């Protein structure tokens, strides 16, 4: 599924992302835009053999099992394929574990480089919650 801005804000709200560990909802929408352009089916092969999966581009080296990432862990105990579903539960819940791992949202390069410092409120504007 390719979500719209407000459709995605709504679902991320439902699953408890608004100010999870202090990050306002707009941070999470902004990250999904620049990571996946809101495409749940997005995959990106990395030069090291790992793959980023889904709307928050969660990486196979640490967080999910894709069966072909050498010397990797499955810290969210999920197959990477579950991160590509039109229901964002597995991505949202895996995100909660990633953001808790000390770097916060700095774990997402697109968030650090394009969302950090900016008015991330622009992303949840004109959305019913
Ligand atoms: Na893995
Ligand atoms: Rh939950
Ligand atoms: Rh765009
Ligand atoms: Rh949902
Ligand atoms: Rh959850
Ligand atoms: Rh770590
Ligand atoms: Rh750590
Ligand atoms: Rh609400």
UniProtKB/Swiss-Prot annotation:
Pfam families: Lys
Coiled coil spans: none
Keyword Secreted among record annotations: yes
Record: active site: 35, 52
Molecular function (Gene Ontology), one example: lysozyme activity
Location (main, coarse): secreted
Subunit structure as annotated in this protein's UniProt entry: Monomer.
UniProt protein name: Lysozyme C
Span of domain C-type lysozyme: 1-129
Species, as recorded: Gallus gallus
Location within or outside the cell: Secreted
Keywords annotated in UniProt: Allergen, Antimicrobial, Bacteriolytic enzyme, Disulfide bond, Glycosidase, Hydrolase, Secreted, Signal
EC class of the enzyme, as a word: hydrolase
Function: Lysozymes have primarily a bacteriolytic function; those in tissues and body fluids are associated with the monocyte-macrophage system and enhance the activity of immunoagents. Has bacteriolytic activity against M.luteus.
Catalytic activity as recorded in UniProt: Hydrolysis of (1->4)-beta-linkages between N-acetylmuramic acid and N-acetyl-D-glucosamine residues in a peptidoglycan and between N-acetyl-D-glucosamine residues in chitodextrins
Cited InterPro entries: Glyco_hydro_22, Glyco_hydro_22_CS, Glyco_hydro_22_lys, Lysozyme-like_dom_sf
CDD domains per the UniProt record, alphabetical: LYZ_C
Entry's family note: Belongs to the glycosyl hydrolase 22 family.
Record-listed substrate binding positions: 101
Tissue: In the egg white and polymorphonuclear leukocytes.
Transmembrane regions: none
Misc note: Lysozyme C is capable of both hydrolysis and transglycosylation; it also shows a slight esterase activity. It acts rapidly on both peptide-substituted and unsubstituted peptidoglycan, and slowly on chitin oligosaccharides.
Record-listed E.C. numbers: 3.2.1.17
GO cellular component, one term: cytoplasm
BP GO annotations: cell wall macromolecule catabolic process; defense response to bacterium; defense response to Gram-negative bacterium; defense response to Gram-positive bacterium; killing of cells of another organism
Database matches in Gene3D superfamilies: 1.10.530.10
């Amino acid at each position: 599924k390719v979500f719209g801005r407000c459709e995605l804000a709504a679902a991320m709200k439902r699953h408890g992302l608004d100010n999870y560990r202090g990050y306002s909802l707009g941070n999470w929408v902004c990250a999904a835009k620049f990571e996946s352009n809101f495409n749940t089916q997005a995959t990106n092969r990395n030069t090291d053999g790992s793959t980023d999966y889904g709307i928050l581009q969660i990486n196979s080296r640490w967080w999910c099992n894709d069966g072909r990432t050498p010397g990797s862990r499955n810290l969210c105990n999920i197959p990477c394929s579950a991160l590509l579903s039109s229901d964002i539960t597995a991505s949202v819940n895996c995100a909660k574990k990633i953001v808790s791992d000390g770097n916060g949202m700095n774990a997402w390069v697109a968030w650090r480089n394009r969302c950090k410092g900016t008015d991330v409120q622009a992303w949840i504007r004109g959305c019913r919650l």
